[model samples]
Target chain A: LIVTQTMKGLDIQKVAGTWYSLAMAASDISLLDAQSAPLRVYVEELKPTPEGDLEILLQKWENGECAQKKIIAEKTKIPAVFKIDALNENKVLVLDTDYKKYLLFCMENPEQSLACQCLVRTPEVDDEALEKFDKALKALPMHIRLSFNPTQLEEQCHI
Target chain B: LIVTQTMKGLDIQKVAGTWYSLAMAASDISLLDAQSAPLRVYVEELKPTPEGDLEILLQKWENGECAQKKIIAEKTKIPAVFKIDALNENKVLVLDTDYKKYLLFCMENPEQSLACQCLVRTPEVDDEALEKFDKALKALPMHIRLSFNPTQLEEQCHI
Candidate 1:
């Protein structure tokens, strides 16, 4: 019962920019475990499409080197709801944002588990923001609530 | 006025997956214009951190090659809200998801323009999903409402 209120009248540009995945939560604890390779995703930027769709710029590591990738999601009548990749059902949505400080989003796993990720302007967050995050999490419905914050990984990136 | 109710009780894992920017909207039309290079961001994966934060894996184009990058947002007392990068006020939040199909998210931009990006499992979206996106956009308070959907880029990627 992941309680959610898809933000209404979303102005996509207000939320656009370089973002960092600061933390995450998952119902399937195993997926988020350290040995699991969990997930390390970031947002390089968000672009609009001529086909009335959206395009995303992303980066990841492969063979000890950084690489770039591009993917786009088509639009639905729902405004913020989108579908990306290989004509699959996997979807994504924008729950809320301040258009300058943070981004809150979620995904529906094929295994019936729920996953949520928070993106911010920086790599670190504060309690004030965390409390707001707590407020966001208090409403969603999922199982085995667990959190992931790799300070070491972030530190490595910094160093 | 940037209205929102960040996903409450957000289980971050449910929304983890490969996400593509299908479409986007911005209060600043120029920023989201084609000439602007608007944005093209993708989500490679979502990882949990040891610091109780979240790590996102992303990909982007760099010198004609795909590049991978990792960024973390520290946890806030607020569950879903996260602050990332350079100790800036920028934040990110999760609004909604079904756990298998889509991931919706928004960001607070420093330029006062609100930006929202809809990510999905597929490169294209159907009418149903987009309608929900419209609903999400209908509620935010911003200026210069504009949409971006780059079919050419996605087609290029597909080809």
Candidate 2:
């Protein structure tokens, strides 16, 4: 079962924003709109790195520690950046972007499946996005870390 | 709080299909696919209702006998219909082709709002659906009956 602290009193529209992958791969983000689609993506808030970037310390097999000091990117004029298309029994589809067109599914973590896409968003050990994610992670959890960095990242767009 | 039950072993999908108002009007049905234009014509499924034969039962208010035998409409295909776009909560767009597209709001009974729509589909006073629903209602010790006859004389949809 997915377990997280209750998001009480947070203005969802204000803190939410668009998530991007800086890698050179090519992929459209809209493929997630289909009911039959299986891939999942999510915009995670993170904690900061010592280099004023993002960092989540990782270990060998399992478990890691998230860096401290999260940096809030310049605040947006709006609160929540996404609208939920579907939210039920652990299945979630969120619409990000100004037009509400680009839909993304965020599957909850699985038990036996080794995820290829999970680490891909963190191509380098020092991507700014990763740093930001690290900060968010630290704030949410007193103890957390990244296990391994991704080998690649890609930009996805909405149709 | 949404609560439901089954006389039979129905999956979550079947239960939601049986309960939710998928759309508010025929116009809404055509709009489900953003790639398509507003036909202003109602299609039955992904397509508009055939030959202007779209009919839906719009319920207002009614009270009937629990002793009335279950009226089962045979071969009734209950498609997930949408909620009324023009209205707020507690309202739904009924798109049954036997009638015209209209808004159905306000539970005929104080406790059960969508009872009318369920009756229209099953017609057979589902002792099963009712018993299951009643068991839930019984938790509060509230004397509310969920069953009702849309028409004074019950009509069977099937032989």
Candidate 3:
């Protein structure tokens, strides 16, 4: 039984834009496998296709170098559930979003193993929005914590 | 004096998809100049830009032919107010919406001379949703009545 519901009221069109990852909860199969390394500034761009799918471009700073990855996510019959072929667990769920400020995404395999959890915000974020993001993260099952590193911006990554 | 307020919590991304005009209260400067025409089947397509704006494509059946118009709407500092440059009166306020069923739009010039309204929905609608639309429309300042013609679909406009 899948304990985590995919998500509801997720409009992919609204979600199809550039987002900056502010924090994350690492899973065994997550892209951030190196728990020892502090989280770096990352950016993801989501675009919608005519066929009603999403194309994703992820850019991040890795070891003082900029790295990027690409993936295509297909919407399933189920709302908020998308299939990304590149991931160990192909399903990506939109946990919540305000579309303008912040978005939370949960990734998992078919067997329901933890894939990863991500918290993203727009290009600009203020103190109030950060507080809201903190409140939302605390409400989750695991007290998801974020590592904030001001130094990451110096080594910025771009698509 | 602007009597109507722009809608809150309107996910413009959700509103960007294709919509079928079910009914409308034509503005003084609207394409539907003939108030006696009973309003034809009109369609609007909204697309979100990376720069956080909207591109609109409107298609309507008029005088036994299909007419098309294009406009770009920029989001204002105020949440839901969008500036569509093509319109004589450049501002568009989202009066109401449920994202899936129905959306109500109010258009007016900056001078507020004539603030007309429009109602649109997906390809299919039911009595319950129609009732909801009625309630939303009625809540406006003036009971803006829509001109409904069931026969318009038979001679529908396509783009």
Candidate 4:
């Protein structure tokens, strides 16, 4: 079993920009193997559905092709907690964030085996932001801390 | 001055499958940095032009995106020698090949400082092919011999 604290008062509007993935670690996700190659995730604008769900258009570069996955999350009574119906019945929680520079997220299941942690930053990360990122990873499990860093893509290049 | 010998009686139809980039060394290509990440190259069909040139569809994964570069090379009077107009007056000459397993190519200019050498193979290379690749690299200059190996993509993935 896993234990974690979710972030409070996360406004989806504030998190609506293209983010470069710094690193990711999950027991079940082999594609997140950082040593193999770099990966990027582009998050589009969040849309609210009639049933109090958020529609997310998530894009990632995989196996030399751009793969886009659509996700629907039901808004929970708890702030910053969303029930992701399609992804292993996991709940995505914002663990920590500055919103402008970096964000750390945790997709937690009751068992840590399938849980994943990801950190994302703006295209250019300054020393201050990097230091913060390092500090956050230090507090996490060993597997997540050892995750390899993802490459930052050029601004004009659309994946 | 650089010295090179082109292959004789090269057939294009036999070279039309995905290849794993084993090693590559170039003066200005930064993505070949061995310590950073692995890379892959994919070649599609060869299109013949009315002007006696061959149109090549070569794709490479770079910076979290698959960058496809279109190349047009004129078939020279000298067999297996191609003059590529798009890439630095570069002339591509086949050094060695088995057609089905592996190929060694040299992109040479009169100036040795700008030359590049690459070795490619099918995803699963056998001991015999590996020995041949090593022997070919041994006769090359020091810089080319120390070239970094690029990553191999899966068979189902398209560049």
State the displacement of the C-alpha of residue A143, model 2, in Å, after optimal TM-score superposition: 60
Write candidate 2's Cα lDDT for B24-61 as tens digits: 11111112211222211111111123331223322221
Candidate 3 whole-model C-alpha lDDT, 0 to 1: 0.54
The global C-alpha lDDT for each of the candidates, from Candidate 1 onward, is 0.56, 0.24, 0.54, 0.50
TM-score per candidate? 0.42, 0.19, 0.40, 0.40
**TM-score of each candidate's B chain against the true B chain:** 0.72, 0.28, 0.70, 0.65
Whole-model lDDT, candidate 4? 0.50
Q: Top model by TM-score, which number?
A: 1
Q: Give every prediction's interface RMSD.
A: 18.3, 22.9, 26.9, 13.2
Q: Residue-wise lDDT of candidate 1 within B1-159, one digit each (tens)?
A: 253757688776566556655545554433332221233344566776656577877655444555576878667877667766744555776666665676666766434556666666665654455556657865663322222234522532211
Candidate 3 structure quality by residue, lDDT tens digits, A75-153: 7887678887763536777766777777766655634344333445544434464455445443333211232333432
Who wins the lDDT comparison?
Answer: 1
Superposed model 1: Cα runs more than 4 Å off: A1-3, A35-39, A50-52, A60-67, A109-111, A141-159, B1-159
lDDT of 2 at B52: 19
Worst 10 residues of 3 chain B by lDDT: B27-36
Task: State the lDDT of candidate 1 residue by residue for A1-159, as single tens digits.
Answer: 243657788766566556665545554433342222233344566776655576878655444544566887767877767777754455777777776877777766334556666667665654455456546865553322222244522542211
Summing lDDT over every window of 10 consecutive residues in candidate 1 chain B, give the lowest-scoring window. Answer: B141-150
In candidate 4, position B59 carries an lDDT of 65
Instruction: Using TM-score, rank the candidates from best to worst.
Output: 1, 4, 3, 2
Over 4 Å off, model 3: A1-159, B26-41, B61-64, B86-89, B110-121, B139-144, B147-159
Angstrom error of the Cα, residue B129, model 2: value is: 3.2
Q: Quick one: ranking by lDDT, best first?
A: 1, 3, 4, 2
